[PDB]
Amino acid sequence: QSVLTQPVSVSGSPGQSITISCTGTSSNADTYNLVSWYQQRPGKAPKLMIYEGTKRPSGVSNRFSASKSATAASLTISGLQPEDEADYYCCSYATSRTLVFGGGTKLTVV
Amino acid sequence: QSVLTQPVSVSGSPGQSITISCTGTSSNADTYNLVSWYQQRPGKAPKLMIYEGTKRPSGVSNRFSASKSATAASLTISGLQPEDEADYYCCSYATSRTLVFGGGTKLTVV
Amino acid sequence: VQLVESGGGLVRPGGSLRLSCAASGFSYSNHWMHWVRQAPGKGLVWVSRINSDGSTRNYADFVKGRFTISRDNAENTLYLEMNSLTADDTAVYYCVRDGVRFYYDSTGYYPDSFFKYGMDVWGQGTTVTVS
Amino acid sequence: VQLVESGGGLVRPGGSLRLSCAASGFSYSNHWMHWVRQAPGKGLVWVSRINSDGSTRNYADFVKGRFTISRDNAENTLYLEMNSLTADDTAVYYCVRDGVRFYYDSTGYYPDSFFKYGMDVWGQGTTVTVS
Amino acid sequence: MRCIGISNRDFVEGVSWVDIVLEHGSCVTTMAKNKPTLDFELIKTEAKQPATLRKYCIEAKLTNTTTESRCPTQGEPSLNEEQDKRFICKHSMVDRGWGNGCGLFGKGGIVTCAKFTCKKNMEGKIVQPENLEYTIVITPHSGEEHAVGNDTGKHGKEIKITPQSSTTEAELTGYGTVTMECSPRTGLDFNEMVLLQMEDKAWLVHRQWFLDLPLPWLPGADTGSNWIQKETLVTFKNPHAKKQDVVVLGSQEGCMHTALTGATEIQMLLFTGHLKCRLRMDKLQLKGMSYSMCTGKFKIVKEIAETQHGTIVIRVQYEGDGSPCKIPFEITVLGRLITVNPIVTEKDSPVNIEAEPPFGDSYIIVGVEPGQLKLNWFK
Amino acid sequence: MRCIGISNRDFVEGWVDIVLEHGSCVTTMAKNKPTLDFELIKTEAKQPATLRKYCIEAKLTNTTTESRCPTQGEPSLNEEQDKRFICKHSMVDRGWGNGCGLFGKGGIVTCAKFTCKKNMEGKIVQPENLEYTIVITPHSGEEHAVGNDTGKHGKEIKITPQSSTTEAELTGYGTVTMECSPRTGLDFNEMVLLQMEDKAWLVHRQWFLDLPLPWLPGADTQGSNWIQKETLVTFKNPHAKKQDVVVLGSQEGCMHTALTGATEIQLLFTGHLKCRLRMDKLQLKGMSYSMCTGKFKIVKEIAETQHGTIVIRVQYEGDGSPCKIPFEIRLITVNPIVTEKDSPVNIEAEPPFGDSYIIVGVEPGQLKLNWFK
Ligand SMILES: *[C@@H]1O[C@H](CO[C@@H]2O[C@@H](C)[C@@H](O)[C@@H](O)[C@@H]2O)[C@@H](O[C@@H]2O[C@H](CO)[C@@H](O[C@@H]3O[C@H](CO[C@H]4O[C@H](CO)[C@@H](O)[C@H](O)[C@@H]4O)[C@@H](O)[C@H](O[C@H]4O[C@H](CO)[C@@H](O)[C@H](O)[C@@H]4O)[C@@H]3O)[C@H](O)[C@H]2NC(C)=O)[C@H](O)[C@H]1NC(C)=O
Ligand SMILES: *[C@@H]1O[C@H](CO[C@@H]2O[C@@H](C)[C@@H](O)[C@@H](O)[C@@H]2O)[C@@H](O[C@@H]2O[C@H](CO)[C@@H](O[C@@H]3O[C@H](CO[C@H]4O[C@H](CO)[C@@H](O)[C@H](O)[C@@H]4O)[C@@H](O)[C@H](O[C@H]4O[C@H](CO)[C@@H](O)[C@H](O)[C@@H]4O)[C@@H]3O)[C@H](O)[C@H]2NC(C)=O)[C@H](O)[C@H]1NC(C)=O
């Protein structure tokens, strides 16, 4: 077992910076080393934003960055834009052979 | 195949005699030799009245008799009583290993 | 002598049901047993028969292979396993004994063509509603 | 690069369904493939994954053994056979590729514990309604 | 009356005890001077207290396949399944390196586990000869309208014997008691023999042969999911150090049947052996014997029919006012009577009389004048 | 570059003769010629003529019986004319107590539907119809090419015992002539490729035809009229009371045991392909490029292969590219070149026994790495 928890919602204003945390219970340093982040815009399919805790795939905006510790993983969005309004999900291993997503964070751009 | 046909309905008055025919299409002398008759009173389970074309089981009223030929089988009810008001069905072999009932005759005692 | 049916009730279209019948007061294992049905306000329709051994199981044309008749002699039980049920199958299902065949073949085994028979014992019937 | 799901629709409770996914524009046979679902108005829920060979098939806890993942490499197809479906299973089902594992294990065979992964290609999803 | 119609039938007659041989699908008719004629049949043979020696898996299925590998020098992999006794596991080595997720190039350890599930089995049972129960049915020649050719048992007294309880006294309602002294004569000795049961088929086989079968088994004690020797039906394949495969070895059902050709087969428990009994009839009495002779006339209910052993069966109904009374019978005297002391119980109930007519033309005379029946036979 | 990481690897140095087989990789080198990696990826039997198909597991369904009273003749069922049904006539004891006016032996007939659950088909395969798939991967020192088993870097080539010789073009290295000779384990003539589900074997024709099992001819594929149904079906009537029809049980494991002393097949075949390689039309990519001037960076820690050789992944920084990488310790990845500064290079070299110095680049910023073999 590993259970991933995220804040239910976060509000931000355009131009500001927001950080979404992903904290685990029966988790360890490897849980956070393997965290991946997904953006799901209203009515759209999810998109990979970060993998391996901090790596950003090509094509993904440089406004998205991520950090990791032995106790949590975090996604940071700098220079908030209205298009960033979406649900964000963290993902990692529940066991050695299964994955699990966090509950998701609804980001509102005010 | 063997298909058994009976009149849809018959009306009779108390004390009178009525005869219900059972005629077959792709049938033969054995079809009629093996005809059995069933009485189904309103809201009751069927009751065997005749078997082997003309044999009456013990307990069945002597007012019920039956006849057979190489072309038809018939059930005769003598001294009609209100309790005779029922649906009557003939039955025989459809094939060497399956049985079939006639469509039934609704007997009304006027 | 009695026959008591069970297992009837409401079933959804395409659904399955298993009817049962408890026999008593006669040598069950030596008798042929039949299933007969009757749609509401309609006539009697022969469904199936089984010999003593279960080596002979016959079915009416409308039972393409959707129905399976079976028996448990020591338990004095008759069954009708029904699958892919439609509104065409809504009816009262009667458990029936062939008492006259017993007087010619007391083993109830031989499936002789066009043998002398008589459905002398009937249950009250169990209602199957495909709705 | 695309993933297109099929087989979604209305299913009765206790019913079965087979989802399919057509993959194109990449070396399908060398990639791990996953199924992810999302109940209406709810979050993403990981369902299953399969390696190149089909020798490793993993399932989420809620799939006791009701779902079987499979693939046909030459046909570029992924499947999800689902039985004993309940209202708990109503969701959009997404076909997903693990593109990052390909850069570490190009065979897509080895089921190493806690492997570096990334679900980089997603289909539009197919709706399953257990109603 | 059961024997009438059975082809494998014996007519045993006692001098002025009487020894008989009963077995499956065989009926026996016994006769003695001033004693009722009786019909014996072995209805069932049963092995009652069977001690399961060993149970073997003949068809298996592998499920829940799981694998774990390690990078070179990172040690040996492990699964929890290796401690689950329903799982079959194997360790091997695979080629590891950069292109398959390892920083180093070398032989990385692998481990494959799969759930061994038995689909079909055969159990071997140790049966004590003395635990072999036999069921004999004794039917008297009562000339009853329904008793002729009846295989139900609503007319016959059922009796149970065992090689130990070999001797039993059995009471017949209206004829007295009959002493049965049976001796066991089975085909093969049950000692060092195992009753190998496979579904509906069964055989009697040598103990050592049975134990030496190369199949997964469960001991007689564990009647379990921890099949011993799972390896006999499971194979692990890793020929190129690329991948390890777990493969089921396929159903041994037909293989077993072929191996069991030169073995004592058992039908299904219908056993090969016969029961050699001794019969004491001193406590038996002819029903009636005190009744007076019938005065009235007789009617022929069913046309005279010949049995497979040349004997004939006559179905007759009484009309006179004498019943219960002795039926007068003669085959002029030439032929003999099988249904000895034929009697009427009720005028309504007809009587079945079995008699042996003489070779050629004969006259079957039933009743006393007026209204005497003078029937004709040709054997 | 495929061979790097494969344990069963050969270093053939030069025409040049090589031996390819399954789970074996081959590295070829020649003076002023590119280093190439060969692997036999697939063996396939292409035009297979089904000889006979056998039933190994069957099921009996639709059991039906008809009897007659003594002297009333022989019974008959329509099923006796249905070729998917197995029937048998016998005699039973008839009489008054079982529905006959006479006592005697009444004829009986039992029919049941023979349905095959599992089969194995025997195929005739022409040796010349055996297609081989070889993958040629050049030592291009590409960042992704190292240990790659996909084929996005290698030219696939097909050969057959007939079309044994093929010229194959490599983008940037020219063409390579390969002249392959077939060397299978068993002669396919008088041999039958017996396929049972996922298992397969090569067996003698007469043995195959002489198997006592129900079968469908090579002509009838998809038929239901199994010949010799009797081999898996048994009729039992020991006491003239009843006739029983019994299935003889799965011959799957029985077959596997019978096939012990037979050539098993995993289509991964036993044989090897002895080829000859002409490299006169092959050319070293670059060879005209100038030497790299800038400094090099060590992208991944130096790793040793199972054959003592070492792999170095390095990235360029200078403004010379495309250029020849200066290297010194023999070299496996001969003529190492930079294509783009961004794309790192994988160099495979054989270090000497004991302490050595791996020197990559020219001063200033020269790399002087240390090895211990
Ligand atoms: C094998 O033996 C079976 C048992 O025989 C018994 O032996 C001893 C122990 C005595 O008890 C003896 O009396 C038994 O016969 C035997 O089964 C028996 O067979 C008869 C059929 O002959 C069964 O039914 C009975 O017969 C009448 C038939 O009526 C017609 O014929 C008479 C003339 O005989 C006419 O007067 C009538 O008008 C009819 O045309 C049945 O109607 C009746 O059965 C039902 O009776 C009431 C009716 O309300 C019901 O409540 C019952 O449930 C019955 O369904 C008679 O009972 C008889 O039931 C049956 N006995 C037993 C114990 O089962 C069998 O036939 C023999 N095998 C062969 C091959 O002969
Ligand atoms: C086995 O070989 C595979 C094929 O290699 C190719 O070889 C020849 C034919 C050339 O075409 C060569 O260029 C190819 O590499 C090989 O697969 C390839 O691996 C790369 C991963 O390195 C795949 O993805 C590509 O890389 C970027 C990574 O971005 C990060 O790194 C860069 C620096 O390198 C940073 O600048 C970034 O900020 C990132 O931090 C991917 O992001 C990208 O993939 C996606 O690109 C767009 C994004 O919108 C999507 O639309 C695509 O669908 C991709 O998902 C790059 O494409 C590369 O796709 C893949 N090539 C092929 C042809 O599949 C494999 O890794 C080798 N096996 C091993 C064990 O190494």
Residue numbers in the entry:
A (entry chain M), B (entry chain L): 1 to 9, 11 to 27, 27A, 27B, 27C, 28 to 95, 95A, 96 to 107
C (entry chain H), D (entry chain I): 2 to 52, 52A, 53 to 82, 82A, 82B, 82C, 83 to 100, 100A, ...
E (entry chain B): 1 to 16, 20 to 226, 228 to 272, 277 to 340, 347 to 393
F (entry chain A): 1 to 14, 20 to 271, 277 to 339, 350 to 393
Authors' own words:
The X-ray structures of both anti-EDE1 and anti-EDE2 mAbs bound to DENV2 sE showed that they bind at the E dimer interface, at a site where the fusion loop—which is present at the tip of domain II—interacts with domains I and III from the opposite E subunit in the dimer. We used a structure-based approach to identify pairs of residues at the dimer interface located such that their replacement by cysteine could potentially lead to formation of inter-subunit disulfide bonds and improve sE-dimer stability. We obtained crystals of both sE A259C and sE L107C/A313C in complex with Fab EDE2 A11 belonging to the orthorhombic space group P21212.
S255 and A259 lying by the molecular two-fold axis, such that they face themselves in the dimer, and therefore only one mutation to cysteine is required to form a disulfide bond. Production of these four cysteine mutants (two single and two double mutants) in Drosophila S2 cells showed that the best yields in disulfide linked sE dimers resulted from the A259C construct followed by the double mutant L107C/A313C, suggesting that the chain can adjust the geometry in these two cases, but not in the other two mutants. Refinement of the atomic models of the mutants was done at 3.9 Å resolution avoiding over-fitting the data as much as possible by keeping very tight geometric constraints. The results are consistent with the introduction of the disulfide bonds in both sE dimer mutants not inducing a gross rearrangement of the global conformation of the sE dimers, as illustrated in the superpositions displayed in Supplementary Fig. 5, with a root mean square deviation of 1.11 Å for the A259C mutant and 0.14 Å for the L107C-A313C mutant over 775 superposed Cα atoms. Of note, we found that the single disulfide bonded A259C sE dimer was fully competent to bind the panel of anti-FLE mAbs, whereas binding was largely lost when using the double disulfide bonded L107C/A313C sE dimer. We surmise that A259C mutant, which is linked via a single bond at the centre of the sE dimer, shows a considerable dynamic behaviour, being able to breathe by swivelling around the central disulfide bond and allowing exposure of the FLE.
